[PDB]
């Protein structure tokens, strides 16, 4: 009796938008809103066989035959312009509530008993947990993913924006929150606050997130890489496709929304490595490992059959865990 | 009811849609881990519908994989420097070519059909012996097609090949077109011992292929030349 | 027990922007703020037959044919001013540190593995002999190509630059300093402990770079070359494009990184030809040839499966080869080609 | 103390005599049940002086064997008859050749060596397939001193080589002068489990080896080309 | 002029002088000297 | 005028390369540029350009 649902899925909540680029000077971050944005351009790249060969040594005159015909391609590229030096990357995220609802189930006793087990969830403690881990991945610029490795400073300004004027400004400096671990601060347990009266459904929260990364003159920032499938073969020059909204080089949304959930700390690994984005067997693509087996009792689905059909309620940071699977969304089902 | 055409396997979506009125199920074409293509195919067809809808995108994938990993090509040309006499698909460079145009102190000389030219010098006898020493298989682009480390003839890097890399070479769908009856014949084994080989974990009866029985079957189909 | 991992892949360090060009008179050196860009023009070039034919030709007939219809090309070209003989091209560079760590990786085995052995190398001497190198390649305007071959003076200012103003600032002139040895100077051994605390992960290193060399009144300067794509095109278009960025000349930041890191002189075939770029299978396209070919064991596949694998440690240059070669970044595993 | 060289075994007489005051022994060779020589030995001979005794009719043994067994050779001519432009040792002949002078109505011809002479017309392009296909192997006269029946391609009619026949290829002292520990490096193994072929008998702990072992040892000996 | 019938071109008179170590007359010379000043894209 | 006009600027052969440079240098051993420079520079004292 009360079998899980054979067709379950839940819309996201934090929707991000797309994360713009704009460029100018440092000091003049409080007149960023005339600042140009970072174009796309295209430039020629000839290189040698740097990977690893094959047949290893047994073919010399072939290497020198590959050396003396290089690869010629044609790459997207984004720099800052030569004049500017700070790297300003804008979106908007809104805060919804109404995390445990499904948008769709196919039976009732499975949803009711969800609900009612996300509602005692609420009820035990907030979403302030949930909300200060996000909060935190707000303060720091994860979000800026390559663009701020090696940033001389990078500063975020987040505007709570009640009707169409500002209520309220946060200005964190993004270097003294580490990415490694979850500090208390007054003005990020406010932005806690908000983040968790958004996500009970006790209120709309819409936030502007502009960060400030002083890079330097002329130097390289990473947009979003697009797809350029079964193109690099007939003519095979254009190897390299970065995104851009409208004349402007941007991120692509999922990659913000994967940046704010970066708040796992709870893997039956270890936790000296830091925190990961929460999925169902939860797993790091660079590095080709799955933390949370489905062999260990920890990944996601197990943990909420435990919770859902037996009752079983794990420890209450698997039940963090779970409840952030819950607000990522998802299709969850007989696959 | 998942079907395998040599490394192909094309598989249903374990839940059906209704389209135009008829019962209709997604199945997906991978080749190993890389999805290469969905369709929406109706119920009652056949398995064997199923496997002529997809050997179009499966041919495709062949002409491009024996025409990206085809071997080298040398000529034999006179002093001139036109009028190729001979060609031969070497699966490997001489190793003493350096860039060269032939002129007229040599009758005969050795170039590669790639445009910034190697060549060598030859007499039509030191020509037969690297032809005989270095030419190439019918099928060594399937050697493309293979990770290397099981290609490889020293035996302390070596690895045995797993199921899927086995179906590369053998089974009725493979790039070869040799069945395991013909392949265990080749190798001197019975049917049930080869296929022993094949069942792809190593729970069920599955013993990996010996480094001499490998380069040997590679041998006998004419993949490598394993000299 | 031990393999390498299937995936591995390393950032680059030492990240130079693009080079812009401008112009202006020597001795104005000092007020080169104002200097007008370079700029990318066309030309016109009617073309002799100056190459070898075949035997199929040669005959007189179709030789003097070729001859009487020419080929008209149209080429892009950069040129000083005729009132200026001073070229001054400037960039950023960016020494960020943590080489070792790959920026994806399989086995976690091999990651710890390789990042003490890294650790290891840190700990039995500096970055100083691979930034001394580096601040060497700095101080000789090698970024400068072509633009540095036959020319009167050239002159690096390199300013490192911490707050958005000047902390420090060396002048170096570069046609003293040889394209082939690695000298001592005091001024350059501080750029190198600058460079070396940039790339220990102990400060945030940003240098802005501006060479100054007098060629000519109205010589020709060169660019970056870019690769056109033409298909069935009609009987005098461009056959050659030059690199700009906002209608300035400019040098991509890849040819300014190649110069930079022409530091390898540990190569078994010779040293008198000089330092070459660092790379796996260390190899020049001008010469078309590869420096540590596999088949000798002094590639980078084969010393770093040496180093990290069997723990055999390799000679301490081919050490600050490998070293080298992880500051330069790369794909290395099984994405074999 | 018997003395084993390859296929070859020199054992004493069991009991000796004495000869001018000097005790002595009669050493004989045999290579397996063929006697070939008897020697008369004194003793407080090392058993070196008692191999380079014999060193010298086993190398004329060499000598015969290498000569009697030699593969055919074809040679490239042209239109003329004389003046062969290129020579190959072939294992096989290319089974289109009938007896054939040649004449200029074609510039190559593919002649055999042996005196009433075979013959085909070639341009260069099949000379190089049939000298890729045909050719031999540098050892390929060892093929003349071993059975047949352990050199054959049909399963069916092959036998596994005894410990003598394997000793013709592998051993110090055999025809390839290629070790144990080499040949067990060929073929991916250890040196004690390819010890376990090189017994004699099938009780002391003794498996016989494989067709695929077999055959791709033989192919990477350079004894037979096993395609 | 320097067609290439009469052994008097570039091409030949490089390749005699480098490979067969044939130095052409002097005002040949000259004349192959000068063409490496002019400067070129010699190969195939 | 800029000098090293044997070396090439790119080449495959390295012994081609080292044959070619020591030909150009026992062309300049036997006699120096004056011959060629004397004309480059009558074609700078008349005006043809």
């Known amino acids: 009796i009360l079998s899980t649902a054979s067709v379950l899925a839940f819309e996201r909540k934090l929707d991000p938008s797309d994360a713009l680029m704009s460029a100018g000077a440092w000091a003049q971050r409080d007149a960023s809103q005339e600042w140009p944005a970072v174009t796309v351009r295209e430039k020629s790249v000839r290189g040698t066989i740097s990977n690893r060969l094959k047949t290893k040594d047994r073919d010399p005159a072939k290497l020198d035959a590959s050396i003396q015909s290089p690869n010629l391609q044609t790459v997207d590229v984004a720099n800052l312009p030569s004049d500017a030096d700070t790297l300003k990357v804008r979106f908007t995220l809104r805060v919804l509530g109404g995390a445990g609802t499904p948008s769709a189930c196919n039976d009732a006793a499975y949803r009711d008993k969800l609900l009612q087990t996300v509602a005692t969830y609420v009820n035990e403690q907030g979403f302030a947990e949930l909300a200060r881990r996000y909060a935190h991945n707000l303060a720091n610029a994860r979000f800026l993913w390559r663009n701020r490795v090696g940033a001389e400073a990078v500063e975020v300004r987040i505007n709570h924006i009640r009707q169409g004027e500002v209520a309220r400004t946060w200005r964190f400096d993004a270097l003294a929150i580490g990415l490694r671990d979850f500090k208390a601060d007054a003005e990020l347990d406010a932005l806690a606050e908000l983040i968790a009266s958004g996500l009970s459904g006790s209120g709309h929260v819409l936030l502007e997130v502009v960060a400030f990364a002083r890079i330097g003159d002329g130097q390289e920032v990473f947009p979003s890489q697009e797809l350029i499938l079964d193109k690099g073969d007939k003519k095979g020059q254009k190897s390299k496709t970065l995104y851009s909204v409208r004349d402007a080089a941007a991120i692509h949304s999922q990659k913000i929304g994967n940046a704010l959930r970066t708040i796992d700390t709870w893997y039956p690994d270890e936790d000296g490595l830091g925190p990961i984005a929460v999925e169902p067997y939860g797993s790091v693509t660079s590095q080709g490992k799955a933390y949370r087996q489905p062999k260990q009792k920890l990944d996601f689905y197990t943990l909420l059959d435990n919770w859902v059909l037996r009752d079983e309620a794990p420890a209450v940071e698997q039940q963090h865990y779970v409840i952030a699977n819950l607000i990522r969304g998802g299709v969850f089902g007989e696959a | ?227």
Request: glycine letters at 8%; a negative charge; aromatic letters at 10%.
């Open chain 2, 1 to 227: 009811n998942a079907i395998h055409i040599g490394p192909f396997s094309i598989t249903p979506a374990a839940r059906g849609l209704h389209y135009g009125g008829l019962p209709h199920h997604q199945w997906t074409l991978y080749y190993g881990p890389r999805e290469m293509a969905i369709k929406t195919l109706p119920d009652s067809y056949t398995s064997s519908e199923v496997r002529d809808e997809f050997s179009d995108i499966i041919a495709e994938f062949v002409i491009d994989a024996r025409h990206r990993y085809a071997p080298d090509v040398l000529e034999l040309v006179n002093s001139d420097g036109d009028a190729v006499l001979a060609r031969v698909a070497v699966s490997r460079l001489p190793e003493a070519l350096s860039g060269c145009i032939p002129d007229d102190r040599f009758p005969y000389w050795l170039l590669t059909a790639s445009r910034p030219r190697l060549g060598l010098p030859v007499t039509l006898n030191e020509y037969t012996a690297l032809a005989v020493e270095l030419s190439a298989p019918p099928l060594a682009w399937i050697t493309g097609l293979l990770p290397g480390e099981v290609l490889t003839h020293d035996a302390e890097e070596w690895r045995p090949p797993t199921s899927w890399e086995l179906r590369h070479v053998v089974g009725e769908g493979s790039f070869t077109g040799v069945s395991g009856a013909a392949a265990a014949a080749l190798l001197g084994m019975s049917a049930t011992n080869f296929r022993k080989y094949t069942a792809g974990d190593s729970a069920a009866n599955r013993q990996k292929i010996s480094f001499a029985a490998w380069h040997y079957l590679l041998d006998r189909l004419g993949v490598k030349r394993a000299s």
